[PDB]
Each structure stands twice: as C-alpha cells, then as structure tokens.
C-alpha cells in the first residue's frame, strides 16, 4: 500500500525505530535477487563471524563453568559503525585466551614429564 | 511521483556526461593550444637575443 | 540556501523601470539602455550588451547602492542584475563590465560595498568576485577582500549564508596564487579550527574540499604539511559515514601524500598510519564495494603505496637504530613478522649488543611501555630461536624477566607471562 | 496536499543533490585537468627551452 | 557477553530487514513496500519523525500510499485474555480479510 521511501542513513534509523514499534512488517521487491548482488552480504557475514566468535566465547564460559545471569540492559539498541572495531577488540580477547588455553595445555604436558623427572631421582 | 525518479536520473547523467566530455575536448585543443603558444613566445625571446646580436655586432 | 529564495521572490517581483526612466535617483542612463540587455535567453542580447561598451552596461548601476537611499528598490535592482552577473554560464565570461580606463577602481568598488550584508550586498559581492578563478587577472587589494573581515568573522560562526560564501572561496581559491597567499594567511587556521568544531555537515564538506585545493602545488604541500591535521581528518572520517566526505577526504590524502617532494615528507605516510588505524577503515571500505570506479583505484594506490610504507617500517636496521637510541613505541616494527622471523639470526648481532641492551633495559627501563615493547621482543627472540633462549638464559634475563610476571603494571603481568610461556618450549 | 508538498520538498532535496556532485565533481575534475595540463605546459616549455638554449 | 550477544542479534536482524527493501536505481535512497493497519498511520510518521530527527540530512520521509491489486492481511489483534480462542481458531485455519 505504502511505498515507504528513505534516505539511506535515514533508513537504517528508521529500520531501528521502526523494529522498536514492532507493528509495520516490509514485503521484499526484489524477490529474484539474493544479498550478493545487493552488496548487503558483506555485512552479513561479518554478523555471521561476530555471532560465530559469541557462541565461541560463551562455549568457553560453559566449560568454565561460570554462571552466566543475563537479566538486564534490553533496550539499548546502539548502531554506530564502529562495532566492528569493537567486536575486533572482542576477537582479541578470544584470540589471546585460545592461545592461553594452547599454552597451558602445552605447559601442563612439560610439568608432566617435569614430575616424572623430578620422581625419578 | 514516478515521473521524477526518470526526469533527475536523465539529468544527473547528461550533466555528468557534459562535464567529462568537456574535459576531455579542452585537454586536447589545449595541447595545441600551448605548443602555439609556447612558439610564440619563444619566437619574442629569439627576436629580442637578435637584437642584442647586432648589437654587440 | 536562504539566498537563492530571495533571489527567486526578487524574479517574481517587479521594478517599473519605465517609471524610473526619469532616474535622477537611479542612474538614468542605464534606466534607458534597460530595453536592451534585459532578455538574456537569446545571445543577440548578449550582442547588445557588447554593443553598449560597458561603459553604458551597468557602469553607472555600479556605485548604484550608494545612489540609492531606499533599501528594498536597491535590494531589487541589485539582485537582478548580480543575479545576471551571477549565472554568467556563457553571458559575458570576460570581465566586460570593467570600464578598462576605470580600472583602478574594479576592484576596488568593493570598499564602498561590503556594507549592509542582510540586502546581500556581500552576498552578490562574494560571486561578483569571481574575476579570478575562469577569468586570468588579478586582485591588486588582496589584503581588502580576503585578510578583511567581509568573511573571516563569519568562518567561525547565517550559517547556511557561510556555506554560500564558503563555496565562493573554493572558487577564489582556483588560482594558485591567491591560494599560495591563504596558506601564508592564518585563515587556514581558523579552518582548521572550525573543522575541529563540530558544526553542519555541508560546511564540514566544504572546508575540507579546500583543503583538497590546498594539495595540488609541491611547494603548499610543503609548507603545510608541518600542520598534523591528518590524524583529526581521519578521525572526522571514521566517525562520520556519508560516502561525499570520504571521497574527498581521500582524495586529499592521494594528492597531498603523493606529491612527494622527498623521502622525509613520505615520513606522513607512516605517521598517519601510526597515529590512526587508517588501515582497517580502508580495508572496511574496500570489502563494501561501490561502483564508483575512482574512489576503487583511489583506494587501490593508497592500500598498496602504505603496504610498501609498512614495508619500509618493517625491516632489522631501524629496529637496531630504535634500541640504539633507548627509545621504543609500539609500531609495525614491533609486529613485523618478517624481522622477527626471517632475522631473528640478525638479533645476534656482534657481540649480542641488541641483547645486551635488551638485558640492561631489564633493570634500568623504569618506563611500563618501553619495558612491556622490550619482554615482547624477548619473548620472540625465545619463541623464535632456542640457542637464543639459551643465550638469554646465561644472560639472566630470566630472573628480571620473572620480577615483570609480578612488576605491578598490569600490562606488565601480561607480557612477561607470555614472553615466559614462549620460554617454557622444550622445558 | 500535505503528501504533495512532502514530494515536492524531497524533489528540493533531489536537486540539492544534483546541483551538489554538479559544482563538487566539476571543480575536481577541472582542477586535476588544469594542473595536468600546466605540467604538459612545463614539458613544452622544456623542449621550447632546450631549442632556445642549443641555439643560442 | 551476554549483552553483546543481544546486541550483535539486533544488528544482524536490522541487515536482514534491509535485504527487504529495494536498492533505488532513482537514487542512493532507499524505498520499499511496507503493509500496517491504518487506523495508526500517524504514530508510524511520528516514527518516521524520529528516526529522520536523528539523522541531520533533514529527511522528509515521503509515505507513498496508493492503492493496490494484492491480498489484505488478517490477524486483529484482541487481548493477551481471549489469546487462546484466537489461537485454536487460527490453528484451523484463517480467513478473508475484514470477515
């Protein structure tokens, strides 16, 4: 009924206020066209790594065994750009704890012929 | 309406095709432009050392 | 943009010129000569107006401000006429209405203007001036316009009437001289400074593409470049994503970088990329692509002229000449995996002097960073080479090293346990 | 209409536009021909220079 | 994490809304079909307003309504009380709009 139509920037605020509504719904014009030919896939798939590198992380508290609450911050909603520097900073983080993890596991098996070292005399 | 989203596009590109179109014809006249120019100018130096030529002649 | 409507509801209203044919209070003459040179749809009438000199074209309406004591006719009258004057597509396009004889006052009409800017007198006169960018003469008064305060007080403060003036002054500063003399101004500073401001958006685009006007002379770019403006102008960058300001900021860094009067003031291309993470902005641009061809190739020479910059930081000899002069900063240097594993062998330098300043910054570097930058190269020297770890281990490197697991800095605690677990092979 | 005038508003912003890259990409493109063409004038004048100076 | 988890799921569900849409051969500006009731098209401008307000290009944010040939949806919404009836009716099927 309704051609909505948008700046680009003005777009993207507008998709955000408008999912914070959560009455309007959009019908896709382009139904013979996929994201790659949208130039959109790019960003998908950083979601993708960004979601990829989360269940990561969390998989890692599980076996940590650290009792996550998650029970506040919902209506945050923030869009700047720089979230994917942010989530580089957090891809650091995961990074330095896989090798801490490599590490230690590598440490461990020298302090195990370390032992037995220390056993025989 | 939907006849601007047609009208805009046409002017847009037209324009665009003008600017670069022009760009590219002055370029090319203006090389030989300043070969001229640059051959005037040289013929005033030659004839000015002529006539410092003849003079210490 | 407030200009422009009143151009549009001045060319909807009417001036009776007819009835000021008797102009003894608006310049007779030109009242008359109005029936010629008033059509300008057809070029015959610009045939007319070369025919009436310029001398009895407007040449009397100039000085007509001061002619005039009412201020809404003036408004009027001046308003078609620069508005004429103005659009100047292929009208005149030789400074006609100059009066050569008169000369020594074409520039100069402008004193007695400049005054009574809400009639937009300055706002006719800042495209009146345009005798210079498509037309090849020059001011004499260049102090009068520019250095005046016509517009220097309103570059730092209406707004919509500063971007109009701003566009004026990009047009000024299509020459090359009077662009040279701005950069001697101190102008550019207050550009800058208003840059740094956060103001509108359409003002921030245009001092920056003067700035992009700036960097097309080696020498400008010379005496410029000792004004580090880069770092804010990515900063801008990365914190506004419009897709205009970038392509000229980009091509202002193509221009003033790639002018390349020497090896020193290539120096820029490193302390940009040191003082702001430029890369993976680029990179980020490159992955989304656009289909404009020029901001592609743009980023094309800029990505790969920095890789072989990165390449320039990345080598053993001014790693040597950095631990040499006790001085040590996080930098490609520091990550350059080529140096640190093709020339871990060069670490052993003679008599391992680089160790042994390693070994002595252990114990009198009483700065964290310097000392954090020296137990990470430490500990690449061990995870690299174990001979080396060997050597570090008669050094007694270790036992500082282990003090730097628990040396207070928190950073501190970070880089020495890595360093210790690269030291923990074969252990 | 108030939806008219709205369409007509954003055809202002369309022409805000236009008029936008019309100056900004002119300007660029003038100003990169004109100092490419003032260093195609430098290396005439080169070959003019060298004329001047074997002759005289 | 456990909110950057929540907010990494918002961003990737905004992109995927923008697959919706219609990339504008008229411009860089976006436009595509959106179906709502219209009893409350006001709040949905009001929206717009803010969403526009954030942003300083000052967007006028056209609502190109018009009328056409496609199937109206059903689904008015009663009550969280009579959520059960509404359910087992829809589970056996839906019907017209306006029925």
Redesign the interface.
């Known amino acids: 009924l309704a051609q909505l139509f948008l700046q680009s920037e003005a777009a993207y605020c507008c998709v955000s206020e408008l999912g914070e509504l959560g009455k309007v719904q959009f019908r896709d014009l382009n139904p013979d066209v996929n994201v790659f030919q949208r130039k959109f896939v790019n960003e998908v798939r950083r979601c993708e790594e960004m979601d990829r590198k989360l269940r990561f992380v969390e998989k890692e508290i599980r076996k940590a065994n650290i009792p996550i609450m998650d029970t506040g911050e919902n209506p945050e909603v923030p869009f700047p750009r720089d979230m994917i520097d942010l989530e580089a900073n957090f891809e650091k983080i995961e990074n330095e704890l896989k090798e801490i993890n490599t590490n230690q596991e590598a440490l461990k098996r020298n302090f195990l012929e370390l032992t037995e070292l220390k056993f025989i005399l | 309406s939907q006849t601007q989203g047609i009208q805009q596009l046409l002017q847009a590109e037209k324009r665009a095709a003008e600017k670069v179109a022009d760009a590219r014809k002055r370029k090319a006249r203006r090389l030989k432009q300043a070969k001229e120019e640059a051959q005037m100018e040289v013929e005033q130096y030659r004839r000015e050392r002529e006539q410092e030529f003849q003079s210490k002649q | 943009n407030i200009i422009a409507a009143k151009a549009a509801e001045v060319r909807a209203n009417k001036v009776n010129w007819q009835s000021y044919l008797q102009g003894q209070m608006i310049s007779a003459e030109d009242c008359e000569f109005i029936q010629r040179f008033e059509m300008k749809r057809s070029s015959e009438d610009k045939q007319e107006m070369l025919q009436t000199e310029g001398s009895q074209c407007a040449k009397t309406f100039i000085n007509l401000m001061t002619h005039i004591s009412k201020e809404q006719t003036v408004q009027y009258i001046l308003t078609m006429v620069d508005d004429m004057l103005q659009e100047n597509h292929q009208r005149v396009s030789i400074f006609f209405d100059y009066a050569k004889r008169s000369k020594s006052t074409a520039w100069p009409y402008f004193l007695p203007m400049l005054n009574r800017q809400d009639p937009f007198t300055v706002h006719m006169a800042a495209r009146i001036i345009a005798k210079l960018a498509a037309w090849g003469k020059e001011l004499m008064e260049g102090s009068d316009l520019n250095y005046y305060f016509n517009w220097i007080k309103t570059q730092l403060s209406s707004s919509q009437y500063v971007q109009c003036v701003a566009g004026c002054l990009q047009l000024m500063l299509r020459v090359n001289e009077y662009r040279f003399a701005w950069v001697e101004a101190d102008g550019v500073n207050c550009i800058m400074g208003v840059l740094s401001n956060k103001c509108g958006f359409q003002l921030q685009y245009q001092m920056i593409f003067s700035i992009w006007l700036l960097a097309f002379s080696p020498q400008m770019c010379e005496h410029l470049r000792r004004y580090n403006i880069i770092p804010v102008l990515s900063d801008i960058l990365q914190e506004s994503v419009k897709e205009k300001v970038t392509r000229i900021i980009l091509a202002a860094f193509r221009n003033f970088l790639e002018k390349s009067t020497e090896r020193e003031t290539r120096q820029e291309y490193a302390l940009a990329m040191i003082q702001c993470k430029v890369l993976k902005q680029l990179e980020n641009l490159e992955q989304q692509k656009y289909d404009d061809e020029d901001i592609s190739e743009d980023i094309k020479f800029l990505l790969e002229k920095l890789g072989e910059s990165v390449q320039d930081l990345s080598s053993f000899d001014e790693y040597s000449s950095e631990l040499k002069s006790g001085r040590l900063e996080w930098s490609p240097v520091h990550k350059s995996e080529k140096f640190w594993r093709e020339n871990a062998v060069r670490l052993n330098e003679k008599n391992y002097e680089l160790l042994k300043i390693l070994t002595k910054l252990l114990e009198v570097s009483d700065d964290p960073q310097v000392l954090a930058v020296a137990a990470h190269d430490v500990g690449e020297y061990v995870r690299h080479y174990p001979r080396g770890k060997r050597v570090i281990e008669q050094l007694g490197g270790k036992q500082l090293v282990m003090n730097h697991m628990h040396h207070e800095d928190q950073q501190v605690r970070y880089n020495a346990l890595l360093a210790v677990q690269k030291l923990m092979v074969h252990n | 209409a108030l939806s008219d005038a709205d369409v007509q508003k954003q055809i202002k912003h369309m022409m805000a536009f236009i008029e936008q890259e019309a100056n900004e990409k002119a300007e660029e493109i003038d100003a990169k021909a004109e100092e490419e063409f003032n260093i195609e004038k430098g290396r005439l004048v080169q070959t003019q220079r060298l004329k001047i100076m074997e002759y005289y | ?38 009893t ?1 098209l006001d ?2 401008q009001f ?2 307003r ?3 307000e ?4 000052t ?10 040939n ?1 199937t109206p949806p059903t689904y008015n919404k009663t009550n969280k009380f009579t959520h059960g009836f509404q359910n087992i009716v829809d589970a056996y099927g839906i019907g017209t709009y306006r029925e």
């Open positions: 994490i456990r909110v950057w988890f929540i907010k990494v799921r918002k961003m990737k569900a905004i992109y995927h809304t923008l697959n919706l849409c219609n990339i504008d051969v008229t411009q860089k500006c976006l436009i595509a079909e959106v179906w709502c009731p219209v409350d709040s949905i929206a717009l803010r969403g526009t954030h942003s300083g290009s967007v006028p944010s056209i609502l190109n309504r018009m009328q056409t496609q």
